[PDB]
Design a protein around this ligand. Structure first.
Ligand code: QFJ
Length: 285
């Protein structure tokens, strides 16, 4: 199958797996304004506003493709309007649907770039918020909502003029250290299988109806290759965070590039690099 056409501009939408500074900017604005419950995100033990110790995967992807990046993703973002952090809603809707809305409002009349790649990577916070705040919805129904929400984002961007998309699957929530510690490995498996079975069917139907260029990145296949043969990728430690934060911050491991996880939820820069390189692989430079 032929490589897809080159990419010169990316518009990225999603959560802390893509965020390159928005949760930092937004939370300082929320702190300055006095919004109740606001905290400085991501925190002290993170690199330059990323929720990791280096560039996120979409930033690597942009580098790999020779593209410029406008990264609208916000740490904590859910697939609908709002954030894992409920207190942000008093200031901005920073979920995927919020990000789409702000991107389209910020065009200032001008058209959508029909050549820009619209990059969508979200859903983990749907599961985390459900599990952390005792959500009552069955997981299959939550998965349904996540899927609807993502499809609706692509439909809305398409309606406004976007033509090119890369949508990332659920990551393997089942091996995230926070999920292991919460004894929630089976819930994560069931959730991520339901999103990843359904989403690509919905996206294929939309891609055909609206004549889109839509690529699907299966992040679970990707992390299964990394975790089955880690020495091949220079990785040694697959389960412990390099930078513990929970219950409290402790000293970082000395060899973070041999680690899969930076904190209890987020991958290291080395995993982000590998993912961004893999994501670039269906596109011509
Ligand atoms: C995990 C994908 C994200 O955006 S991190 C946001 C906050 N949390 C406590 C790690 C869920």
């Amino acid at each position: 199958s032929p490589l897809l056409a080159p990419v010169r501009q990316i518009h990225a939408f999603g959560d802390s797996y893509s965020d390159n500074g928005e949760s930092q900017r937004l939370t300082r604005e929320m702190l300055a304004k006095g919004i109740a419950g606001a905290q400085a995100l991501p925190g002290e033990v993170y690199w330059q506003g990323r929720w990791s110790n280096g560039p996120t995967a979409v930033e690597v992807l942009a580098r790999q493709l020779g593209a410029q990046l406008a990264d609208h993703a916000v740490g904590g973002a859910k697939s609908g309007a709002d954030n894992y952090y409920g207190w942000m809603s008093a200031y901005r809707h920073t979920g995927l649907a919020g990000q789409v809305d702000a991107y389209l409002a910020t065009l200032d009349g001008k058209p959508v770039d029909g050549q820009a790649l619209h990059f969508i990577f979200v859903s983990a916070n749907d599961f985390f918020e459900h599990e952390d705040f005792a959500g009552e919805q069955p997981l299959e129904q939550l998965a349904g909502s996540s899927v609807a929400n993502i499809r609706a984002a692509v439909q809305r961007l398409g309606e406004a003029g976007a033509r090119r998309f890369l949508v990332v699957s659920s990551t393997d929530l089942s091996v995230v250290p926070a999920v292991v510690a919460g004894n929630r490995v089976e819930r994560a498996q069931r959730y991520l299988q339901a999103v990843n079975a359904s989403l690509p069917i919905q996206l294929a139907a939309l891609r055909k109806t609206r004549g889109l260029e839509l690529s699907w990145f299966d992040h679970l296949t990707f992390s299964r290759h990394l975790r089955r043969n880690p020495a091949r990728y220079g990785l040694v430690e697959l389960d412990a965070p390099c930078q513990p934060t929970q219950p409290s911050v402790r000293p970082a491991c000395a060899n973070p590039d041999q680690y899969y996880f930076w904190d209890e939820w987020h991958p290291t820069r080395r995993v982000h690099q590998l993912a961004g390189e893999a994501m670039a692989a269906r596109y011509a430079r």
